[PDB]
């Protein structure tokens, strides 16, 4: 039982409620501005629950954010409640540098079928949040409220890329294998509890705005203008940046400052 009314209020959406491309675009823009990307719970060693009541409690009622499964499960339920035809996908993250040739299928996105065309939707990528749905058409450069994006087709996957700094940079790679909640729950368990997850060893946060994007990785704050960099020197500063600048909830401030020391994010 999904509370569509509460969700649209959480994201500040007052437009028409229907299963149109105009609506999908307004939701895709509004969601990552209103609901931050963050791993506060995993960083603090608390569990991430993916069931729908737990998601609404945390994010909608509780005003918090989340990482990809939390964002995209939520978006999926809302789109389904609005009457969109929607399925889960999974992706391997290519953004940044990995110690793996092939990285794990650690990211979730969505496919949306609109008048017999396939779009992808993804309001939960931490590296760089997409702010518009994208047509699944290889090669085609697609305008969004922020950067241009494109999907390229390789041997047996699609790669989503964004135009950043004059380069096409790959966010992740995916195929069309369908994913269900049970599949995400396995990956979620790994990412929120394995000592090998970077979601446990550091803070990762992001939020979109009209003119800019905010990104925090550990002690590095970046503001990307439609690019200011601050290095955060202390746990108190990190917490103030999270809570003040980024609108992120820290549910246990002393456990937070204590974790920041253990991980030496700031040291």
Short mmCIF file of C-alpha atoms in Angstrom, two decimals:
data_model
loop_
_atom_site.label_atom_id
_atom_site.label_comp_id
_atom_site.label_asym_id
_atom_site.label_seq_id
_atom_site.Cartn_x
_atom_site.Cartn_y
_atom_site.Cartn_z
CA UNK A 1 0.00 0.00 0.00
CA UNK A 2 1.91 3.00 -1.37
CA UNK A 3 1.04 6.51 -0.28
CA UNK A 4 1.28 8.41 -3.56
CA UNK A 5 -0.03 11.69 -2.02
CA UNK A 6 2.68 11.74 0.65
CA UNK A 7 5.38 10.88 -1.88
CA UNK A 8 4.48 13.74 -4.25
CA UNK A 9 4.40 16.14 -1.29
CA UNK A 10 7.87 14.87 -0.23
CA UNK A 11 9.17 15.86 -3.69
CA UNK A 12 7.24 19.11 -4.10
CA UNK A 13 5.32 17.91 -7.15
CA UNK A 14 1.97 19.61 -7.67
CA UNK A 15 1.43 18.78 -11.37
CA UNK A 16 -1.04 16.42 -13.08
CA UNK A 17 -1.18 12.78 -11.89
CA UNK A 18 -1.03 10.56 -14.97
CA UNK A 19 1.29 8.26 -16.84
CA UNK A 20 2.58 10.74 -19.38
CA UNK A 21 6.06 11.62 -20.57
CA UNK A 22 5.58 15.19 -19.26
CA UNK A 23 4.87 13.74 -15.79
CA UNK A 24 7.81 11.30 -15.91
CA UNK A 25 10.07 14.23 -16.78
CA UNK A 26 8.73 16.46 -13.97
CA UNK A 27 9.13 13.60 -11.43
CA UNK A 28 12.58 12.73 -12.66
CA UNK A 29 13.65 16.34 -12.22
CA UNK A 30 11.91 16.93 -8.83
CA UNK A 31 12.93 13.69 -7.04
CA UNK A 32 16.77 14.09 -6.94
CA UNK A 33 16.38 17.78 -5.97
CA UNK A 34 14.18 16.91 -3.03
CA UNK A 35 15.57 13.58 -1.83
CA UNK A 36 19.33 13.45 -1.33
CA UNK A 37 21.60 10.55 -2.24
CA UNK A 38 23.32 9.45 1.00
CA UNK A 39 24.62 6.35 2.81
CA UNK A 40 24.23 7.65 6.37
CA UNK A 41 22.67 4.40 7.58
CA UNK A 42 25.24 2.00 6.03
CA UNK A 43 28.11 4.31 7.17
CA UNK A 44 26.78 4.12 10.76
CA UNK A 45 26.40 0.32 10.53
CA UNK A 46 22.58 0.40 10.46
CA UNK A 47 20.53 -1.82 8.17
CA UNK A 48 18.86 -0.60 4.99
CA UNK A 49 15.35 -2.10 4.61
CA UNK A 50 13.88 -2.17 1.04
CA UNK A 51 10.31 -3.16 1.83
CA UNK A 52 7.83 -0.44 0.91
CA UNK A 53 6.64 0.49 4.47
CA UNK A 54 10.21 0.88 5.64
CA UNK A 55 11.04 3.07 2.56
CA UNK A 56 8.12 5.44 3.14
CA UNK A 57 8.83 5.63 6.92
CA UNK A 58 12.47 6.62 6.33
CA UNK A 59 12.30 8.83 3.26
CA UNK A 60 8.76 10.18 2.90
CA UNK A 61 7.55 10.46 6.53
CA UNK A 62 11.01 10.69 8.12
CA UNK A 63 12.41 13.18 5.59
CA UNK A 64 15.63 11.22 4.97
CA UNK A 65 17.43 10.15 1.82
CA UNK A 66 19.03 6.94 0.70
CA UNK A 67 21.20 5.22 -1.82
CA UNK A 68 20.23 3.65 -5.19
CA UNK A 69 17.85 0.80 -4.19
CA UNK A 70 16.03 3.06 -1.79
CA UNK A 71 15.67 5.85 -4.38
CA UNK A 72 14.71 3.66 -7.30
CA UNK A 73 12.40 1.30 -5.46
CA UNK A 74 10.60 4.32 -4.19
CA UNK A 75 10.45 5.96 -7.64
CA UNK A 76 9.24 2.66 -9.09
CA UNK A 77 6.35 2.39 -6.64
CA UNK A 78 5.34 6.00 -7.34
CA UNK A 79 5.49 5.49 -11.10
CA UNK A 80 3.48 2.29 -10.77
CA UNK A 81 0.89 4.14 -8.66
CA UNK A 82 0.67 6.79 -11.41
CA UNK A 83 -0.02 4.08 -13.97
CA UNK A 84 3.38 3.73 -15.71
CA UNK A 85 4.59 0.37 -16.98
CA UNK A 86 7.92 -0.09 -15.12
CA UNK A 87 10.53 -2.81 -14.44
CA UNK A 88 13.80 -3.09 -12.51
CA UNK A 89 17.26 -3.37 -14.08
CA UNK A 90 20.69 -3.71 -12.58
CA UNK A 91 24.00 -2.13 -13.67
CA UNK A 92 27.76 -2.50 -13.07
CA UNK A 93 29.29 0.81 -11.96
CA UNK A 94 32.06 2.16 -14.20
CA UNK A 95 32.24 5.68 -12.73
CA UNK A 96 35.69 6.18 -11.23
CA UNK A 97 38.50 3.65 -10.74
CA UNK A 98 37.97 0.04 -9.77
CA UNK A 99 40.30 -2.73 -8.63
CA UNK A 100 38.08 -5.07 -10.72
CA UNK A 101 38.17 -5.45 -14.50
CA UNK A 102 34.44 -6.24 -14.20
CA UNK A 103 32.67 -4.59 -11.28
CA UNK A 104 29.68 -6.08 -9.41
CA UNK A 105 26.10 -5.42 -10.49
CA UNK A 106 25.80 -3.01 -7.58
CA UNK A 107 23.46 -0.35 -9.03
CA UNK A 108 19.71 -0.35 -9.72
CA UNK A 109 17.89 1.53 -12.43
CA UNK A 110 14.48 1.27 -14.08
CA UNK A 111 12.99 0.75 -17.46
CA UNK A 112 9.75 2.52 -18.35
CA UNK A 113 7.62 1.62 -21.35
CA UNK A 114 5.84 4.62 -22.77
CA UNK A 115 3.66 4.20 -25.89
CA UNK A 116 5.79 1.23 -26.91
CA UNK A 117 9.08 3.06 -26.45
CA UNK A 118 11.61 2.09 -23.74
CA UNK A 119 13.07 4.75 -21.44
CA UNK A 120 15.48 4.28 -18.61
CA UNK A 121 14.90 6.21 -15.38
CA UNK A 122 17.36 6.43 -12.51
CA UNK A 123 17.00 8.92 -9.70
CA UNK A 124 19.49 7.10 -7.47
CA UNK A 125 22.95 7.19 -9.00
CA UNK A 126 25.37 8.63 -6.43
CA UNK A 127 28.18 9.51 -8.83
CA UNK A 128 26.01 11.84 -10.92
CA UNK A 129 22.23 11.89 -10.66
CA UNK A 130 20.23 11.78 -13.87
CA UNK A 131 17.44 14.42 -13.89
CA UNK A 132 15.45 13.24 -16.90
CA UNK A 133 14.36 9.86 -18.30
CA UNK A 134 16.44 8.73 -21.30
CA UNK A 135 15.32 6.98 -24.45
CA UNK A 136 17.09 3.60 -24.82
CA UNK A 137 18.54 4.41 -28.21
CA UNK A 138 22.26 3.77 -28.73
CA UNK A 139 24.39 6.70 -30.02
CA UNK A 140 21.74 9.34 -29.55
CA UNK A 141 22.76 12.41 -27.54
CA UNK A 142 20.03 13.47 -25.19
CA UNK A 143 19.53 16.80 -23.52
CA UNK A 144 18.56 16.95 -19.82
CA UNK A 145 18.10 19.82 -17.31
CA UNK A 146 21.79 19.26 -16.56
CA UNK A 147 24.45 17.49 -18.67
CA UNK A 148 23.83 15.76 -21.99
CA UNK A 149 23.76 11.95 -21.68
CA UNK A 150 23.90 9.13 -24.13
CA UNK A 151 23.67 5.38 -24.18
CA UNK A 152 26.18 3.45 -26.22
CA UNK A 153 25.76 -0.16 -27.27
CA UNK A 154 28.65 -2.58 -26.75
CA UNK A 155 28.94 -6.32 -27.45
CA UNK A 156 26.47 -7.47 -24.77
CA UNK A 157 25.59 -4.37 -22.70
CA UNK A 158 24.54 -0.74 -22.85
CA UNK A 159 26.72 1.95 -21.30
CA UNK A 160 25.18 5.12 -19.91
CA UNK A 161 27.51 8.11 -20.34
CA UNK A 162 27.41 11.83 -19.44
CA UNK A 163 29.17 14.74 -21.13
CA UNK A 164 31.38 16.15 -18.35
CA UNK A 165 34.46 18.38 -18.99
CA UNK A 166 34.18 17.94 -22.74
CA UNK A 167 34.43 14.10 -22.43
CA UNK A 168 31.83 11.30 -22.60
CA UNK A 169 32.32 9.55 -19.28
CA UNK A 170 30.74 6.16 -18.51
CA UNK A 171 28.54 5.94 -15.40
CA UNK A 172 27.63 2.27 -15.61
CA UNK A 173 26.85 -0.65 -17.90
CA UNK A 174 23.67 -2.72 -17.98
CA UNK A 175 21.68 -5.29 -19.87
CA UNK A 176 17.90 -5.76 -19.92
CA UNK A 177 17.70 -8.72 -17.53
CA UNK A 178 14.71 -8.03 -15.21
CA UNK A 179 15.32 -7.63 -11.48
CA UNK A 180 12.87 -8.12 -8.63
CA UNK A 181 12.90 -6.94 -5.06
CA UNK A 182 14.47 -10.24 -3.91
CA UNK A 183 17.49 -9.60 -6.23
CA UNK A 184 18.06 -6.08 -4.89
CA UNK A 185 17.73 -7.31 -1.34
CA UNK A 186 20.80 -9.55 -1.89
CA UNK A 187 22.92 -6.79 -3.40
CA UNK A 188 21.65 -4.37 -0.74
CA UNK A 189 22.81 -6.72 1.97
CA UNK A 190 26.33 -6.83 0.50
CA UNK A 191 26.56 -3.04 -0.02
CA UNK A 192 25.22 -2.05 3.39
CA UNK A 193 27.11 -4.70 5.47
CA UNK A 194 30.28 -5.97 3.78
CA UNK A 195 33.55 -4.42 5.10
CA UNK A 196 34.52 -4.41 1.40
CA UNK A 197 31.70 -2.01 0.49
CA UNK A 198 32.82 1.61 0.00
CA UNK A 199 29.37 2.50 1.37
CA UNK A 200 30.76 1.44 4.79
CA UNK A 201 34.19 3.04 4.68
CA UNK A 202 33.22 6.56 3.60
CA UNK A 203 30.42 9.10 3.23
CA UNK A 204 28.82 9.51 -0.15
CA UNK A 205 26.18 12.14 -0.74
CA UNK A 206 24.59 14.10 -3.51
CA UNK A 207 21.69 16.38 -4.27
CA UNK A 208 20.54 18.07 -7.49
CA UNK A 209 19.57 21.72 -7.81
CA UNK A 210 18.21 23.90 -10.71
CA UNK A 211 21.59 25.61 -11.44
CA UNK A 212 24.01 23.09 -9.91
CA UNK A 213 24.71 19.62 -8.48
CA UNK A 214 26.20 18.89 -5.03
CA UNK A 215 28.59 16.03 -4.52
CA UNK A 216 30.41 14.85 -1.41
CA UNK A 217 32.83 11.99 -1.34
CA UNK A 218 34.54 11.57 1.99
CA UNK A 219 35.97 14.96 2.84
CA UNK A 220 35.65 16.46 -0.68
CA UNK A 221 32.69 18.70 -1.42
CA UNK A 222 32.09 19.60 -5.06
CA UNK A 223 29.47 21.99 -6.42
CA UNK A 224 28.99 21.57 -10.17
CA UNK A 225 27.60 24.69 -11.79
CA UNK A 226 25.25 24.62 -14.86
CA UNK A 227 32.96 23.69 -10.21
CA UNK A 228 33.79 24.80 -6.61
CA UNK A 229 35.78 22.39 -4.41
CA UNK A 230 36.06 22.48 -0.61
CA UNK A 231 38.07 20.02 1.46
CA UNK A 232 36.28 19.44 4.77
CA UNK A 233 38.82 19.18 7.58
CA UNK A 234 36.79 17.99 10.58
CA UNK A 235 33.93 15.69 11.66
CA UNK A 236 31.96 18.67 12.92
CA UNK A 237 32.45 20.44 9.55
CA UNK A 238 31.41 17.28 7.65
CA UNK A 239 28.29 16.96 9.78
CA UNK A 240 27.43 20.65 9.32
CA UNK A 241 27.98 20.36 5.56
CA UNK A 242 25.74 17.25 5.42
CA UNK A 243 22.99 18.68 7.61
CA UNK A 244 23.17 22.33 6.57
CA UNK A 245 24.26 22.50 2.98
CA UNK A 246 22.89 19.17 1.73
CA UNK A 247 19.75 18.77 3.86
CA UNK A 248 20.79 15.32 5.09
CA UNK A 249 19.64 13.78 8.36
CA UNK A 250 22.19 12.36 10.79
CA UNK A 251 20.11 10.29 13.29
CA UNK A 252 22.98 9.81 15.81
CA UNK A 253 25.46 12.64 15.83
CA UNK A 254 28.01 11.17 18.29
CA UNK A 255 28.00 7.75 16.59
CA UNK A 256 28.55 9.76 13.36
CA UNK A 257 31.57 11.70 14.67
CA UNK A 258 32.84 8.43 16.15
CA UNK A 259 32.57 6.64 12.76
CA UNK A 260 34.24 9.54 10.95
CA UNK A 261 37.25 8.95 13.24
CA UNK A 262 37.36 5.13 12.81
CA UNK A 263 37.29 5.45 8.99
CA UNK A 264 39.66 8.44 9.10
CA UNK A 265 37.59 10.18 6.36
CA UNK A 266 38.71 13.49 7.71
CA UNK A 267 42.15 12.38 9.05
#
